[PDB]
Amino acid sequence: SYRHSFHAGNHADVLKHTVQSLIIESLKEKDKPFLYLDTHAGAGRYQLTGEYLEGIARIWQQDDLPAELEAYINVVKHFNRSGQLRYYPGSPLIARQLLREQDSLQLTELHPSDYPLLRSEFQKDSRARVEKADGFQQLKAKLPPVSRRGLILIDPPYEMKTDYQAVVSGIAEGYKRFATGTYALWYPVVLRQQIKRMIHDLEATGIRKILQIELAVLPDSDRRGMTASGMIVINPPWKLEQQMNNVLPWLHSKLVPAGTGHATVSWIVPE
Ligand SMILES: *CCCN(CC[C@H](N)C(=O)O)C[C@H]1O[C@@H](n2cnc3c(N)ncnc32)[C@H](O)[C@@H]1O
């Protein structure tokens, strides 16, 4: 039975899957195949009361949906053709629906209950390989892709402050093996100081061309839980900065009617 999740489809998922879909659509502009590598792939889909009421529900049926959200929202509608929100597609299903016949998917998830669900989403998809394995080890084992093109999505649990260091080390290892790939790292903002230190750690790797996309629903706080989330993109498609500048004001206005927080795009390290 599909996994239920109180947080699925919230503002952070909206931002993460919007960015994912735009990167995939840019990669599809060239006919050459590419790899989609999902290090922390989850269950695949989520059965939706819940934070989706403040996230995807606020945008998916809007008449003025920006063109930059059409690919993502059309996947959500594919899984909800009745017009009632019942299922939220995870990053693996976004990729399954947007990738072309010549592209490849490599998905990993250690969760003992969610790995079987993920496997069942791809049992009839010959483009995909699903493994019950550590996500960061895939940045060593699966890179570089034989196709020499790819999006690597890194979407891990952040459960203590050593995890923030593990993500940067993992990315450095992937980048050493595949310096031209696009790496998209999702992060939460609970304590801003922890994100500031992670970003410094990422800069200290020497990797260039790192874009930061962040959407906050509340100002930074000491005891409000997750107030924001973002995507750090290494080697973003050239269009992505402008696409996010086009869509972030609309997205923030729909996700946060009270107008609190912010939505920004900027460079951590330039080319
Ligand atoms: C940041 C947590 C995201 N994670 C993967 C989501 C996937 N990329 C998507 O876009 O749909 C959520 C799923 O990861 C698995 N998981 C395993 N262990 C945890 C912990 N400790 N916290 C959260 N998530 C965990 C689950 O399958 C989640 O649904």
Numbering used by the authors: 3 to 50, 58 to 280
What does the publication say?
We previously designed adenosine-SAM bisubstrate analogues that contain the SAM cofactor with the S-atom replaced by a N-atom directly linked to an adenosine at the point of nucleophilic attack to mimic the substrate/cofactor bound state. These molecules were used to study the substrate recognition of the m6A MTase RlmJ, the Ribosomal RNA large subunit methyltransferase J that N6-methylates the adenine A2030 of the E. coli 23S rRNA. m6A RNA methyltransferases (MTases) catalyze the transfer of the methyl group from the cofactor S-adenosyl-L-methionine (SAM) to the N6-atom of adenines at specific positions in RNA, releasing the cofactor product S-adenosyl-l-homocysteine (SAH). Two crystal structures of RlmJ in complex with RNA–SAM conjugates were solved and revealed the RNA-specific recognition elements used by RlmJ to clamp the RNA substrate in its active site.
Crystals were obtained for GA* and GA*A bound to RlmJ at a RlmJ/ GA* ratio of 1/2 and RlmJ/GA*A ratio of 1/8. The GA*A conjugate density was not well-defined with RlmJ/GA*A ratios <1/8. The structures of RlmJ bound with GA* or GA*A were refined to 2.3 Å and 1.6 Å, respectively. In the RlmJ/GA*A structure, the ligand is folded via π-stacking of the ASAM moiety with the guanine moiety of GA*A. Compared to SAH, only the methionine part of CA is well-positioned in the active site of RlmJ. Asub is pushed out of the active site and unable to form the stabilising interactions with H9, N12, K18, and W195, observed for the GA* conjugate. The GA*A conjugate is maintained bound to RlmJ through correct binding of the methionine part and the stacking of the adenosine at the 3′-end (A3′ in Figure 5, corresponding to A2031 in the E. coli rRNA) with the conserved residue F8. A folded conformation was not found for the GA* conjugate, suggesting that the formation of such a folded conformation depends on the RNA length and sequence. F8 π-stacks with A3′ in the GA*A-bound RlmJ structure whereas H9 π-stacks with Asub in the GA*-bound RlmJ structure.
